[PDB]
């Protein structure tokens, strides 16, 4: 009653979808994919919150591997909403006959290596067991929900929603709603909620820096232009650092005139785009403290220009390093001018407890709500690995293997875990993610086909190669400001999670070259157990 398969894929987002296509169609392997989700989509299945939008531009937030698909797909606007991405991924699944290969509504709860037979034994929450030669983990770097336990929470008589588990069709129009969190998710859901809702209470702990998204309609002339030049657009993207489709600046910020610097930021501001403001503006906003301060200072002044009430402005003024994930919005600061929206500064004025009726802050004020929305983010990157029973050689648990910081070789493998691969695992690229996912999935499929064609029973990186990769990512990370940014990117967002590097910050171009060259070099750093 245990099922023998060549490959197990975990996840039905961009990663899993593509892994199943590659392993089944190109490699000719029996392949089973799993997701707890009732359908494919990953991020775009789960994040049904109002205002959910990509901030990779429409034409870049998709697969590139199928040139005809690129000519076929269409979009409304310069950025693309959750339902449109969801519809795009569903179509990819239909397009390549992938749906039959997935088990939806099914969580993998265990994956144990069997040393004697060189197989993985995988168990689901339903009690089915699979034996597989390969495991591809496409489990998401931003899917393990972080849901802080506030005092008194289970006392709340109203509805509780995490944004990354928003129920389909759930509308909060006409309700009294509080939001916890003002990262990329909070800004989007706040902006969307405010006109529809009776009252919106925002519990803001750290106000953030955000530029306009500049999400504009696209006419058939506009999509045409893009599509006719799609080959060159993708080559530029795959030859850049972050692949968002603007040219990345090398120009130091303090090298230029005080006025042009202002004009450059202003033209970036009016154009829109979060990554463009940080990197298509000057080449050292992320690397030079004065350059970063100039950027930060520019945004701060817009905030003081937007928010009318001096007190509300003070509470929402972003402070400190402009060194979290770059943000952009469709009118976020504007909403705090609306009479129905209330800002609560929870650093000055902490939450005392949640009650039946709402949230009491330490000033002793009850904030009456009947819905609480958690835009509190994720245990990022490693989170979904640590929540599962995964054991490699000699029963070594993932959590004992990664007893300190989580590690990889090349973002895609780890020692003592043979034939077990990761898509967007620890210490991989920090970019517009689809083309990074494509790079990793393609590389994993090539190494699996290699192993199949040769006599290979097990392939895993050496401890030395992994540690050298840790050192390479650490060196690169020290050269940027993200590390002093105090956010999820360096695992600083959950008390109890140890902070560390979690990304290779070299960019897509340098990453692709590393990946190409390790393969061209006979999988340098891997040990290969033959038949």
Ligand X SMILES: NC(=O)c1ccc[n+]([C@@H]2O[C@H](COP(=O)([O-])OP(=O)(O)OC[C@H]3O[C@@H](n4cnc5c(N)ncnc54)[C@H](OP(=O)(O)O)[C@@H]3O)[C@@H](O)[C@H]2O)c1
> In the numeric block, which tokens belong to residue 261?
């610097």
**Number of residues located near ligand X, criterion CB under 6 A:** 32
Q: What is the 3-state secondary structure (H, E, C) of 222-241?
A: HHHHHHHCHHHHHHHHHCCC
Distances (CA, A) of 138 to 143, 328, 399, 417, 502: 11, 27, 18, 16, 16
Residue with Cβ nearer ligand FAD (182 or 185): 185
Burial of 314 (0-12, 13-18, 19+ CB in 10 A): middle
Is 374 among the residues that bind ligand FAD (CB under 6 A)? no
**Number of residues located near ligand FAD, criterion CB under 6 A:** 35
Among 21, 22, 24, 36, binds ligand FAD (CB under 6 A): 36
Residue with Cβ nearer ligand FAD (438 or 460): 438
Partner whose binding site includes residue 165, from ligand FAD, ligand X, none (CB under 5 to 8 Å by kind): ligand X
Q: Which stretch binds ligand FAD (CB under 6 A): 48-56, 251-259, 320-328, 442-450?
A: 48-56
Is 61 among the residues that bind ligand FAD (CB under 6 A)? yes
Residue 235's closest CA among 364, 377, 425, 64? 64
As a whole number of angstroms, the distance between CA 13 and CA 437 comes to: 10
* Residues 86-125 as x/- pattern, contact with ligand X by CB under 6 A: ---------------------x------------------
Shortest distance in whole angstroms from residue 247 CB to ligand FAD: 18
Residue with Cβ nearer ligand X (140 or 418): 140
Partner whose binding site includes residue 292, from ligand FAD, ligand X, none (CB under 5 to 8 Å by kind): none
Which H or E run contains 195? helix 184-196
* Residues 188-207 as x/- pattern, contact with ligand X by CB under 6 A: x--------------x-xx-
Partner whose binding site includes residue 40, from ligand X, ligand FAD, none (CB under 5 to 8 Å by kind): none
Contacts within 8 Å (CB) and 24+ apart, 304-312? 306/333, 306/334, 306/337, 307/333, 307/336, 307/337, 308/337, 309/336, 309/337, 312/336, 312/337, 312/343
Partner whose binding site includes residue 12, from ligand FAD, ligand X, none (CB under 5 to 8 Å by kind): ligand FAD
Residue with Cβ nearer ligand FAD (12 or 20): 12
Site residues (CB under 6 A) for ligand X, limited to 24-53? 36, 46, 53
Other CB atoms within 10 A of residue 300 CB: 17
Burial of 293 (0-12, 13-18, 19+ CB in 10 A): middle
Q: Which stretch binds ligand X (CB under 6 A): 137-145, 288-296, 392-400, 500-508?
A: 137-145
Find how far residue 488's CA is from the centre of its chain.
Answer: 10
Q: Where are the beta strands (DSSP E) in 156-198?
A: 159-162, 176-180
* Chain interruptions in the chain, by residue before each (C–N > 2.5 Å): none
Shortest distance in whole angstroms from residue 252 CB to ligand FAD: 27
DSSP-assigned letter for residue 217: B
Q: Residues 6 or more apart from 524 whose CB is under 8 A from it?
A: 465, 518
> In the numeric block, which tokens belong to residue 356?
């039946």
Residue with Cβ nearer ligand X (292 or 361): 361
Is 323 among the residues that bind ligand X (CB under 6 A)? no
Site residues (CB under 6 A) for ligand X, limited to 157-186? 164-165, 180-186
Residue with the two structure tokens 């489709």: 245
Is 37 among the residues that bind ligand FAD (CB under 6 A)? yes
> In the numeric block, which tokens belong to residue 508?
């897509």
Is 140 among the residues that bind ligand FAD (CB under 6 A)? yes
Other CB atoms within 10 A of residue 140 CB: 24
Is 143 among the residues that bind ligand X (CB under 6 A)? yes
Q: Which stretch binds ligand FAD (CB under 6 A): 127-135, 219-227, 249-257, 430-438?
A: 430-438
Among 55, 57, 379, 466, binds ligand X (CB under 6 A): 55
Is 432 among the residues that bind ligand FAD (CB under 6 A)? yes
Sites of contact with ligand X (CB under 6 A): 36, 46, 53-55, 107, 140, 142-143, 145, 148, 164-165, 180-186, 188, 203, 205-206, 325, 346, 375-377, 384, 488, 493
């Amino acid at each position: 009653t245990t099922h023998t398969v060549d490959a197990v894929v975990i996840g039905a987002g961009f990663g899993g979808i593509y892994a199943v296509h590659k392993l089944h169609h190109e490699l000719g392997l029996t392949t089973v994919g799993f997701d707890k989700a009732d359908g494919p989509g990953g991020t775009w299945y789960w994040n049904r919150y109002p205002g959910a939008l990509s901030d990779t531009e429409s034409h870049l937030y998709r697969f590139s591997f199928d040139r005809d698909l690129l000519q076929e797909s269409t979009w409304k606007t310069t950025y693309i909403t959750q339902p449109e991405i969801l519809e795009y991924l569903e179509d990819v699944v239909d397009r390549f006959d992938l749906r039959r290969h997935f088990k939806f509504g099914t969580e993998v709860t265990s994956a144990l290596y069997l040393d004697d037979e060189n197989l993985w034994e995988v168990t689901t929450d339903h009690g089915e067991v699979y034996r597989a030669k390969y495991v591809v983990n496409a489990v998401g770097l931003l899917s393990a929900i972080n849901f802080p336990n506030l005092p008194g929470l289970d006392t709340f008589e109203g509805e509780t929603i995490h944004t990354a588990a928003w129920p389909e069709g759930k509308s909060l129009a006409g309700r009294r709603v509080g939001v916890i969190g003002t990262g990329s998710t909070g800004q989007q859901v706040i902006t969307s909620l405010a006109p529809e809702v009776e009252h919106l209470t925002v519990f803001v702990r750290t106000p953030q820096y955000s530029v306009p998204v500049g999400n504009r309609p696209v006419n058939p002339e506009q999509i045409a232009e893009i599509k006719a030049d799609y080959d060159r657009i993708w080559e530029r993207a795959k030859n850049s650092a972050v692949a968002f489709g603007f040219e990345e600046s090398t120009l130091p910020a303090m090298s230029v005139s005080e006025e042009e610097r202002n004009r450059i930021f202003q033209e970036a501001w009016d154009h829109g785009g979060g990554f463009r403001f940080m990197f298509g503006t000057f080449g050292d906003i992320a690397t030079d403290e004065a350059a970063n301060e100039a950027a930060a200072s520019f945004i701060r002044a817009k905030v003081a220009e937007i928010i009318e009430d001096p007190e509300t402005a003070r509470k929402l003024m972003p402070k400190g390093l402009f060194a979290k994930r770059p943000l952009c919005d469709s009118g976020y600061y504007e909403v705090y001018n609306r009479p129905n929206v209330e800002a609560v500064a929870i650093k000055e004025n902490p939450i005392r407890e949640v009650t039946a009726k709402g949230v009491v802050t330490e000033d002793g004020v009850l904030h009456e709500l009947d819905v609480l929305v958690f835009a509190t983010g994720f245990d990022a990157v490693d989170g979904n690995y640590r929540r599962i029973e995964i054991r490699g050689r000699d029963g070594l648990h993932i959590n004992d293997h990664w007893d300190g910081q989580p590690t990889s070789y090349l973002g895609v493998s780890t020692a003592n875990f043979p034939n077990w691969f990761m898509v967007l695992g620890p210490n991989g690229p920090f970019t517009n993610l689809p083309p990074s996912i494509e790079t990793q999935v393609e590389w994993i499929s090539d190494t699996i086909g290699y192993a199949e064609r040769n006599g290979v029973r097990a392939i895993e990186p050496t401890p030395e190669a992994e540690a050298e990769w840790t050192e390479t990512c650490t060196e690169i990370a020290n050269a940027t400001l993200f590390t002093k940014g105090d956010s999820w990117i360096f695992g600083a967002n959950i008390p109890g999670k140890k902070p560390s590097v979690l990304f290779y910050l070299g960019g897509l171009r340098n990453y692709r070259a590393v990946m190409a060259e390790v393969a061209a070099d006979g999988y340098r750093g891997f040990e290969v157990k033959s038949a």
